[PDB]
Write a protein that binds this ligand. Structure first.
Ligand SMILES: CC(=O)N[C@H]1[C@H]([C@H](O)[C@H](O)CO)O[C@@](O[C@H]2[C@@H](O)[C@@H](CO)O[C@@H](O[C@H]3[C@H](O)[C@@H](O)[C@@H](O)O[C@@H]3CO)[C@@H]2O)(C(=O)O)C[C@@H]1O
Ligand SMILES: CC(=O)N[C@H]1[C@H]([C@H](O)[C@H](O)CO)O[C@@](O[C@@H]2[C@@H](O)[C@H](O)O[C@H](CO)[C@@H]2O)(C(=O)O)C[C@@H]1O
Ligand code: SIA
Ligand code: SIA
Lengths: 114, 114, 115, 115, 115
């Protein structure tokens, strides 16, 4: 598995606008909401869960990276895998999107798979 | 268990106004005090204790996130489970509330379970 | 044991003004000096030692918290247990105070135990 | 092995201009892009992958340091070993370079190994 | 052993002017260069090697503290043990000094041992 796999999805030129931390079923998790830097489109929501999904090993790295980009407000590309989380209330609160990567973006391009 | 379980309680549009770090019964712990962003109402006090309670796995994540939100002074939703800590002197000084989640808040909504 | 036990001591309206990190007898340790925000009184010195004393488990959390408060210069309450460290050259350089807690302070009170 | 082995490669007076974090084959990894402070030449790309390659042990330290230099935008020397990552899509997106060290630089020299 | 042992060496009123991180023999390491704040004298170079020497336990604490003081440019006392590292090219690039402590130095005397 890889962040950049074409079965994952990404959204470019987003700003991380919200951050949530919690626990579910013995596992720390976090979620972020992102919106286009230019005001267009719909918000993206994705979560990472420390002990769940193939993406579990990168939990701490993604959490720290999300916090950094959140604190700066800079434009980023968010990589997700759709339809992972399954607890209905959790999905309805956030989304079924697993967060699988974060890339910095300049004006015209982002540094990461596309 | 989940941060968002309806048997937990939460308080929106709060600011983390104080932070304390200590140790109890072999465990580092931290407690926070939060107040309404607008200055109304009654302060909320919650603690997290390393290697104690079902919420233990999230101790470091919550500590890190509390320190961040404390340093920014931004509006947040605090999520707690009541009646967890039983050490009487500790409860008298702080409270029996376990901290179980933290969510950033815009002016219109908080990013988390409700 | 608890930070807030009446057998510990505390000092309010202090500011962390120095920080030292080192190692002794295979254990990382750090020490801080605090002084009254208003310049009065006598400095307080306390150290935490990673593998020693009943307070060992909170070493990392207190080091990080000390670093934070040292960086902001904000007024805090420092909690110690007296007469813990015993190596004479160490005590004479620093003190025998074990660091057992740190609380943020407001104008009129601090957020932490007090008798 | 060592960061400063002559079989490694280094690039001086670079600025870390982009940062990516992701996961591959069970391992979190990060990559950085660096560009000459003077605007010349071609960007250098290097990645570190947790628990992969002989450089695995230094993953966290390099991530932390890359984040630091990325945030300041100061000029550094980036040290890499070429031809380490072999996953073709990953290499195409980023490069085969393993990140093996970072050195700060003054205007006249960098603090790290050099031929 | 202790940072403050009289068999160690220390240098007061220094600042951390450079920082390098890398790996050697499967161990993360970092080195710092310090110079007198006032510009007199000659630089001191010291390194900490994560898996190596009696000082190994303090590696993360020293690296974290080194980063902090490097970022602020504030005065410090650096404590070292001489003639520890032995890999020749490494020693020639950096030094044989192991970093064994860091003390803040705002006050009249630095906050740390000075035997
Ligand atoms: C390994 C070693 O010798 N360490 C000693 C150091 C070094 O010799 C010195 O740092 C290298 O230049 O010197 C130490 O003592 C110095 C210290 O007490 C400082 C004040 O913190 O004073 C220095 O003398 C200065 C003094 O500040 C003024 O009189 C100035 O005008 O000149 C003199 C000498 O130039 C001391 O050398 C140290 O702590 O750095 C003691 C170490 O053991
Ligand atoms: C070990 C001890 O007695 N600690 C006292 C502390 C010290 O006596 C004092 O800080 C020495 O400088 O004093 C404490 O109470 C303080 C009052 O004495 C002071 O007049 O006002 C302070 C306002 O916060 C404070 O209330 C303290 O520092 O909290 C009490 C403590 O036990
Ligand atoms: C235990 C409890 O009462 N929770 C409720 C709180 C509190 O009444 C006030 O927030 C007190 O600050 O009010 C809410 O509107 C909120 O803050 O989001 C809904 C929430 O369910
Ligand atoms: C692989 C390689 O040749 N690295 C060399 C680089 C590059 O040629 C240029 O940096 C490319 O832009 O140049 C140096 O002067 C430098 O940066 O310190 C010496 C270094 O050995």
């Amino acid at each position: 598995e890889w962040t950049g796999d074409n079965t994952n999805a990404y959204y470019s030129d987003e700003v991380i606008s919200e951050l949530h931390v919690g626990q579910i079923d013995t596992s720390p998790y976090f979620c972020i909401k992102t919106v286009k830097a230019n005001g267009s489109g719909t918000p993206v929501v994705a979560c990472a869960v420390s002990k769940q999904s193939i993406w579990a090993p990168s939990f701490k790295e993604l959490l720290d990276q999300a916090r950094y980009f959140y604190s700066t407000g800079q434009s980023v590309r968010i990589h997700v895998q759709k339809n992972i989380w399954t607890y209905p209330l959790f999905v309805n609160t956030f989304s079924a999107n697993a967060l699988v990567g974060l890339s910095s973006c300049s004006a015209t391009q982002c540094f990461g798979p596309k």
